[PDB]
Design a protein around this ligand. Structure first.
Ligand SMILES: *[C@@H]1O[C@H](CO)[C@@H](O[C@@H]2O[C@H](CO)[C@@H](O[C@@H]3O[C@H](CO)[C@@H](O)[C@H](O[C@H]4O[C@H](CO)[C@@H](O)[C@H](O)[C@@H]4O)[C@@H]3O)[C@H](O)[C@H]2NC(C)=O)[C@H](O)[C@H]1NC(C)=O
Ligand SMILES: COc1cc2ncnc(N3CCC(CCP(=O)(O)O)CC3)c2cc1OC
Ligand SMILES: *[C@@H]1O[C@H](CO)[C@@H](O)[C@H](O)[C@H]1NC(C)=O
Ligand SMILES: *[C@@H]1O[C@H](CO)[C@@H](O)[C@H](O)[C@H]1NC(C)=O
Ligand SMILES: [Ca+2]
Ligand SMILES: [Cl-]
Ligand SMILES: [Zn+2]
Ligand SMILES: [Zn+2]
Length: 679
């Protein structure tokens, strides 16, 4: 009887033969296996279904931007964002190197491109043998390390052969055998492209893919290993249906010119031809203004690197062309001339979502877990091979719930900020505008106050009746303001006597804006933030029309909001150095973004002051001085786009939320790494 034919066996302890000190781990990849493919055609795919059922599965695995092969596989194996690991796209150009990058190129094997540290390098650096069978970067001198077995990419190698050869290396002697393996298949991505994501072709592709996984599983059976190998079935990204009738051509807006090179598809980027002579010279900003709001329903949108949604993490690398285009589902873009299956879109689109299944002794049997970014996988792979992971973008421990016996028991980040209290100091002035505690504190910060990770920043906690403000004495402005807005609730300001009187405090004196809205003290100087007029339309609608609407839906919401200063667009909090170097002229420090974390309970009957389980959403909102970005409906539509993980917020603000929460550290991490999927 074949492996597919049997019922679900439990694997409480690894049942390995002698010569196996521990389970070996296989990272099988099937290119462009849209997460959806399983949601529908599971009944046609018995093998993957059994893997789903006797294993740890997730309905959606969120890939990285851009949703292409090379950036995603290399993200999988480094736990890094493309912006940090180097491989930005299958086709890219580095102006510092003056070099191009093609898969069909000599540069394809150049070690300068691939940054970070893949799992096999990590395994090698720690005396663990590793055998790949095709994997982006595996045949490349990364840190001078190759895998202990590898294959240079020859795409025409039969699939059934790749399955056999991996099954052979498991037969290898205990001294030269790998402990970590990778497979790769081009399907269903080939058929995905050639015939589109919905076609009898992809069904065929899927059923081959299915049967070949069945083979490996039968081979592992016929090696005494079906209860010994830890399998991870995975994919890079999903697959979207192609257009012709939904393709943007920039010749219409520019004339059919040949002076700018423009990367095609949904991941569209633009740079000058005269490169690297005119790369940093080029005024991109004006070309963007020349291209925003140019149609009734403009299905594309220009975006200078830093002003893209930060949740994408696509700006730090110099390989990223300073002018990108965000696109709407299904739509692509070129410079000049379409009906093919494609990918590369927003990582939050439904069809970009990827497959993840974990089978074997380490993983749970028949557990559906929530959705996660693929950058988390690296840390899970380090755990499974007893490796200390390289520094990476995964929140290490957030996947502990996949594992029967998890290794890493994580703990919250320790507070590094300096937290002295603010008594009544600046007695006593006016601005001339035309005008017990523990019970109050607990109410403002029901989940615990944010913890200042900012080493070693001087912060004051300021108690008010309706809200708790976290004021920065190193920046003389608030960092955060938390209030609980329960389900049922104009040119004047007051001096806060606990904060130093900076001249920016009077009405006489880009404007001010309130962190906690007054329509519920909120007119304290310690509650105002520097804010543009074109942002005030977003802000005053958010707290009036939008936020009050949510309070009813959720039965109360708890809000934390504040400034974000990310001038160098990495998506982390800026050093005080570059804070000085970006304070425009009074010598105001001026926020690039405003964050807002909305916290409800999953149980609607509970109010935020009394949640069992948490419900979270967060927003990194961009503080642009005009609403060119967005041209009732438009303000919400901006919020949904500029969503962020709570972790994204923590990274960018140096704050840490929910440390005082019933939930374990691992549960909170999973909560804080949540993003919701569009369509
Ligand atoms: C995703 O995770 C990665 C991995 O940790 C992380 O990227 C890393 O960020 C740090 C800081 O930006 C990088 O370290 C830098 O290295 C270069 C030289 O190679 C230096 O120029 C930098 O020096 C500054 O920082 C020093 C101390 O921190 C200061 O003393 C000094 O004055 C400089 O200001 C800095 O040391 C590191 O190389 C990267 N690694 C990679 C692989 O990119 C990234 O932040 C994470 N992404 C997100 C969105 O959180
Ligand atoms: C490390 O050397 C290579 C490893 C590869 N591993 C996986 N897939 C590869 N391909 C390149 C991407 C191709 C898919 C196209 P898409 O980017 O998913 O649109 C399929 C073949 C590799 C291509 C490679 O070199 C060309
Ligand atoms: C950069 O490389 C290109 C292509 O190899 C070449 O044409 C050019 O001379 C180089 N230019 C500079 C300015 O280094
Ligand atoms: C790729 O592998 C196949 C099967 O072994 C072989 O027939 C073919 O010649 C190989 N191509 C190259 C370029 O090595
Ligand atoms: Ca920064
Ligand atoms: Cl679930
Ligand atoms: Zn791919
Ligand atoms: Zn593809």
């Amino acid at each position: 009887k074949s492996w597919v034919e049997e019922t679900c066996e439990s694997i409480d302890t690894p049942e390995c033969p002698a010569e196996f000190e521990s389970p070996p781990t296989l990272l099988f990849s099937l290119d462009g296996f849209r997460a959806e493919y399983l949601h529908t055609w599971g009944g046609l795919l018995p093998v993957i279904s059994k893997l789903k059922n006797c294993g740890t599965y997730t309905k959606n695995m969120r890939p990285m931007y851009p949703t292409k092969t090379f950036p995603n596989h290399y993200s999988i194996v480094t736990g890094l964002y493309p912006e940090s690991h180097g491989i930005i796209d299958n086709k890219m150009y580095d102006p510092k190197m003056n070099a191009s990058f093609s898969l069909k190129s000599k540069e394809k094997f150049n070690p300068l491109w691939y940054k970070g540290q893949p799992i096999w390098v990590t395994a090698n650096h720690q005396e663990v043998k590793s055998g790949t069978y095709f994997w982006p970067g595996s045949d490349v001198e990364i840190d001078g390390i190759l895998p202990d077995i590898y294959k240079v990419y020859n795409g025409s190698v039969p699939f059934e052969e790749r399955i056999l050869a991996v099954l052979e290396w498991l037969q290898l002697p205990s001294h030269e055998r790998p402990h970590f393996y990778t497979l790769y298949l081009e399907e269903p991505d080939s058929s995905g492209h050639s015939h589109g994501p919905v076609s009898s072709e992809v069904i065929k592709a899927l059923q081959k893919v299915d049967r070949l996984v069945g083979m490996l599983m039968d081979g592992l059976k016929d090696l005494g290993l079906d209860k010994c190998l830890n399998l991870i079935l995975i994919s890079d990204h999903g697959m979207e249906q192609g257009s012709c009738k939904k393709y943007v051509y920039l010749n219409k807006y520019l004339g059919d010119v040949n002076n700018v090179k423009v990367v095609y598809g949904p991941a569209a980027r633009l740079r000058p031809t005269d490169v690297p002579e005119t790369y940093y010279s080029f005024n991109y900003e004006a070309l963007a203004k020349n291209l925003s709001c140019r149609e009734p329903n403009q299905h594309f949108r220009p975006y200078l690197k830093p002003f893209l949604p930060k949740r994408l993490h696509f700006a730090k690398s110099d390989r990223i062309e300073p002018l990108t285009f965000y696109l709407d589902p299904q739509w692509q873009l070129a410079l000049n001339p379409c009906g093919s299956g494609f990918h590369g879109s927003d990582n939050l689109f439904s069809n970009m979502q990827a497959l993840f299944i974990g089978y074997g002794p380490a993983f749970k049997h028949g557990a559906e877990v929530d959705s996660f970014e693929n950058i988390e996988v690296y840390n899970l792979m380090c755990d499974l091979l007893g490796l200390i992971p390289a520094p990476n973008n995964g929140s290490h421990g957030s996947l502990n719930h996949l594992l029967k016996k998890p290794i890493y028991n994580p703990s919250h980040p320790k507070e590094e900020g300096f937290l002295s209290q603010c008594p009544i100091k600046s007695t006593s002035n006016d601005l001339g505008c035309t005008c017990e505690d523990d019970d109050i504190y607990h109410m403002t910060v029901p989940y615990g106050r944010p913890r200042i990770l900012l080493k070693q920043h001087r912060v004051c906690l300021l108690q008010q009746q309706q809200f708790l403000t976290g004021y920065s004495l190193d920046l003389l402005m608030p960092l955060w303001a938390s209030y609980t807005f329960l389900s049922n609730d104009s040119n004047c300001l007051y001096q806060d006597l606990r904060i130093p009187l900076s001249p920016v405090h009077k009405c006489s004196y880009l404007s001010y804006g309130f962190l906690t809205p007054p329509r519920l003290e909120a007119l304290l100087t310690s509650n105002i933030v520097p804010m543009y007029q074109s942002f005030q339309v977003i802000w005053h609608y958010l707290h009036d029309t939008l936020l009050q609407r949510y309070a009813h839906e959720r039965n109360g919401i708890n809000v934390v909001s504040g400034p974000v200063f990310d001038f160098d667009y990495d998506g982390r909090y800026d050093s005080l150095e570059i804070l000085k170097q970006n304070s425009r002229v009074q010598e105001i420090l001026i926020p690039t973004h405003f964050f807002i974390v909305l916290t409800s309970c999953k149980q609607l009957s509970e109010t935020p002051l009394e949640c069992s389980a948490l419900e979270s959403s967060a927003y990194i909102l961009p503080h642009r001085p005009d609403n060119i970005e967005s041209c009732s409906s438009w303000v919400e539509e901006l919020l949904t786009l500029h969503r962020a993980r709570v972790t994204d917020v923590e990274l960018i603000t140096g704050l840490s939320f929910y440390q005082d929460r019933q939930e374990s550290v691992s549960e909170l991490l999973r909560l804080k790494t949540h993003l919701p999927i569009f369509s």
